[PDB]
């Protein structure tokens, strides 16, 4: 008969699919506790043990880049203000764990092995391993339920999102106006405040301007 | 098409090191019949999965159609000057290069792209199941960022 | 037959100037078909494409 | 700072490394070795190791023939094919002595088998000669076209379906003055010299390939040879994997252990390279007469039949020469048959000395070659030789202090010998080598090296402090074998888990050879996960499945499921594997009788097997 | 042409201290050896030497102000002891199409903690396995090697 | 025609006239903007940033002006049919104005060569996209073609 282990030193025991679905879990359980944590001192919360079965997952050549990553990303989003959205913060807190280090690079997936082969998670919009239907409200993490969100009491309803692109702010729709449709590798170019029209992934394109200041971590 | 139109450096082509023993005019040829088929088919609206070159002079010389000896029973050419089995002369020794060192260096480095997408397998419930998936990702996350796997899929 | 030999004649893009190591190339035929703009520590410098 | 590979034995012994020098494993493009001037050099070193055999002329295939046996004994280290007859019998009679009864049992045990086999039997095997197409067929067209002749020629008699029914008609057929073969209407009238020189051919595309009057013959003798290697312990054939790893180490500690600790231990690992030419059908006939000692004079006739047809074998000439005018941009091609009387201007220094030595040779197109065999039809007969050699070497037989044993296979050997001094070894491993030359067994010295006893190597498994590395197989393909989605899943999967079971193949290896599995078989099929992005005409369908299902695990791999299969769990049918998690729905719509499409490998009678248009 | 007729060209009739960018393409040097700089150039900022002959860089005078220097296709092979000292505030550096056999004589260049940027092409060291990270290693304040970081990422001006 | 073409045909009727050009940049920059022969230029252009490049140019020609010795033919050339629009001020740096090619942004360096616009000095030869669009009168670093 199925036996269940909630604990968070079980979670590697039923599969990676297993240890991706009740890390999400985790976070969606504690969601309130770790907002508060993420606003107040968030240092502590990369340094939470809970997380220790992603990093596992994540490949070690890439999981410091991937950190520092997440890092600039989330203090982007604490210094923007305006622009929350819970949904990526629980998508993407969990590759925060590693001892960031600086890079360049603007990580469009993150790579999570799972059974060998290795699945990608995409930083904006959907991905298989982590779907979010909000006709429902429900998280599906490879096709097995992790629990339920709740919006928090900070949200942007209106475009603008802060937490997608590294040194970027998105604006929403695109417009034909601007320039057309660039790269993200030529987004390098850019100058401070500068304004594109971006060709961030699938098939839709999104206005993108360069900030202005700098997000620093530790 | 798509990845020869991100390029606009194209210049005359011109031969700088020639082919000694054989035929240099008719590949710069080939490659100008090449660019402007790719134009012509830029030109097209319905354009099927796959076009194949018109017959030409410079094609037919650069593959060795008209360069191809023909077939004749050993009766109608046995009274020839020049007629000698065929050159299974061992080939005249060559001294080392530093080339393929070089060659070999640089296909082991590390490259930055993952050039090789394996499927999934089932859990692993043994302990040597898990010696085996250790091994092997190990291996794999190793090599999978190597020059290697990129010749491999070309 | 399994043996029979297709003849084909191969186009391939490079970098490499072939007048460094010839005896490497023999078997090749070198045009220049346009030149390429790579960044360097003194801007986008021009360098021939080689086939 | 530059990559050296070889490098890596600096620190790592050579054994723990050797799949390091394996370039390939695997079959190359190439096929270097086939043709016709290597048929040329193979009968002239065949004739020149016998350059002081006695010579004569044939009177049935009107041929030369060169019997070096019990020719002058051999002064120099060079190769020698003169096999002492006596000395063979004697070492025969000893290998009984050692083990009595032995070719006693073999004899008996086989009898029935000699009257059991049916014709078909004789379908099974590689490519044939077929003398009414004078060209390499399918065994199983060669029999029916066979059948079909000697039917017309009025011999039935092999309809009874005996093997041996079968035997006797191609003797019969062989005794007759002349016959007819009938194409498809061509009539061809083959006279007794010439039916007979083509029953005794050797196509040469086991590289070479005898007619189908010789394939029972050949069948019985080496199913003798095996059941009497069987019961030697010296043999390398016919055991697998783990058994020859066993037999090292057993040898090993027989050898090393027993001995004192004064005494001196040495092993010589040995390559009999070209080993074809100095063993002659005649010396195997001579030991095939010992073996069926008191016997059934009709056995003794059907299995002694073998080596006496081969010692008047005939091997043809490759397909031809190909030559070529740079000046006239032309070529052609001639044939074999055209090659006897020809001029040597066309062709090169070595090859036209080749052509000259050759040349009083070439009857009907076909060189004559009475001594010396072909690779790959007496190969047990071979290592029952290599055993009694080295049952010879017994400390009764050597009367010496020093003694010797070890491993044959007819392909590579090992012998260990031990002696109280060094000058015990050298003496041993001289007494060993100059009997194995009396017996027309030779040993490469260029290809061969001692070292004290613990490291060696045989038929390339590797033996090193009781660690033994095989590397004697190959990695098979790992594809889709083309008959249905569920007869291709399970075969493959077969063939994986029979791999890992003896051809030593590592766990990861077999994974990753599952995945590439995997990958192939969706490719090939077009059944890919739903979850997966990949984009088909079948993932429409495939999809509506994927949302249909409320257990992903059940649906099967070629309906775009996951695959579940692993090291633990590979034996288990991929539908059987599913069956519980199936939803009862599926079940029932998956495996219903009525379908429509449906009016060896271990698997379930589903829809998704079928019969390709 | 030869240098000295070539910097009085560039010059263009003025002290030669309002200088911040000099370009000496297609020129010739007598024994292979830089003449005609001197330490009156104190305002150069952007030097460039291509196709210059030279066999060393010898002679350089100490350009403090020196911080995109270039010696671009030529045959300068020996110590660079000499650039580490007598311009000590190098930032970007080509040495594109240079003789140089092995990175014991590119070690010196690590005394320069301002150099931001290093180019290599066609030279005899990028022939070595792992060049890239092992030149990385050997000058740490780099960071981008030939037009590329450590992580293979285009360097914008 | 097309915009590929057309990119080349601007630069040609800029460097044609070079003289007047350069007369009327070094005393009435004003007029020479106003240039009607500049309108399809600034169509590819796209209608929300021309008013930032112009601006942007404006000022660094501003700036050109008010120091001397630094004469730079090439980037004027470069940077001249940018500023033909109603030039909207603006602070931020600019370092690769956009410039539309059938749907393609194809940017343009301030500093330096780019693929639109590469010019050789080596042989002092001005190319556009690849296509060939000319070669300047010039050969000594003082402002003269006496040689």
Known sequence: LTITYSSSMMWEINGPESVLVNTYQWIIRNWENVKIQWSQDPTMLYNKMEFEPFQSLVPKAARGQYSGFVRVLFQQMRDVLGTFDTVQIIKLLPFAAAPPEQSRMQFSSLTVNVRGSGMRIVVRGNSPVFNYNKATKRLTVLGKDAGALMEDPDEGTAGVESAVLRGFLILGKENKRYGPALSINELSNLAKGEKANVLIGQGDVVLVMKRKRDSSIL | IKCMKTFFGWKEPNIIKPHEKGINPNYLLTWKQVLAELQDIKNEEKIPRTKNMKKTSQLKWALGENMAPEKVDFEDCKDVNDLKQYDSDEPEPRSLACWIQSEFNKACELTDSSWVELDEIGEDVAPIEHIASMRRNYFTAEVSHCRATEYIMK | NDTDVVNFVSMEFSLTDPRLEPHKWEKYCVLEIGDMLLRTAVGQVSRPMFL | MDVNPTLLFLKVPVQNAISTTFPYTGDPPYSHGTGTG?????????????????????????????????????????????????????????????????????????????????????????????????????????????????????????????????????????????????????????NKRSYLIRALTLNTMAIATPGMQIRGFVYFVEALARSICEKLEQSGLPVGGNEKKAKLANVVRKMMTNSQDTELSFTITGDNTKWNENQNPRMFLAMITYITRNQPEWFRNVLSIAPIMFSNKMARLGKGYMFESKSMKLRTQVPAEMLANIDLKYFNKSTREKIEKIRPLLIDGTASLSPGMMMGMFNMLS???????????????????????????????????????????????????????????????????????????????????????????????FGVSGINESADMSVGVTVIKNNMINNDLGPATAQMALQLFIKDYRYTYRCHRGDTQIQTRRAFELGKLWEQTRSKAGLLVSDGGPNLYNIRNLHIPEVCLKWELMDEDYQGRLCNPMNPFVSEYDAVATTHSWIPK | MEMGRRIHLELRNRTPSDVKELVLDNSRSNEGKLEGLTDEFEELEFLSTINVGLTSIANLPKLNKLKKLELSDNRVSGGLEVLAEKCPNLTHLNLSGNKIKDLSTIEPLKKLENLKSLDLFNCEVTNLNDYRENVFKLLPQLTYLDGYDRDDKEAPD
Request: aromatic share 10%; charged share 25%; net charge negative.
């Open chain 4, 38 to 190: 290597y048929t040329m050099d193979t009968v002239n070193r065949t004739h020149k190791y016998s350059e002081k055999g006695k010579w004569t002329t044939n009177t049935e295939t009107g041929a030369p023939q060169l019997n070096p046996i019990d020719g002058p004994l051999p002064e120099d280290n060079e190769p020698s094919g003169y096999a002492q007859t006596d000395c063979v019998l004697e070492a025969m009679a000893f290998l009984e002595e050692s083990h009595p009864g032995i070719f006693e049992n073999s004899c008996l045990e086989t009898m029935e088998i000699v009257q059991q086999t049916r014709v078909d039997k004789l379908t099974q095997g590689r490519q044939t000669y077929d003398w009414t197409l004078n060209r390499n067929q399918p065994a199983a067209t060669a029999l029916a076209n066979t059948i079909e002749v000697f039917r017309s020629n009025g011999l039935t008699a092999n309809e009874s379906g005996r093997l041996i029914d079968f035997l006797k008609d191609v003797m019969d057929s062989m005794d007759k003055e002349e016959m007819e073969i009938t194409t498809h209407k061509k009539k061809q009238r083959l």
């Open chain 4, 383 to 477: 290592t029952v030789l290599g055993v009694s050699i080295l049952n010879l070497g017994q400390k009764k037989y050597t009367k010496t202090t020093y003694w010797w044993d070890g491993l044959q296979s007819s392909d590579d050997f090992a012998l260990i010998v031990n002696a109280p001094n060094h000058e015990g070894i050298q003496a041993g491993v001289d007494r060993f080598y100059r009997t194995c030359k009396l017996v027309g067994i030779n040993m490469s010295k260029k290809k061969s090296y001692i070292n004290r006893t613990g490291t060696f190597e045989f038929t390339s498994f590797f033996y090193r402090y009781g660690f033994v590395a095989n590397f004697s197989m190959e990695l098979p393909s």
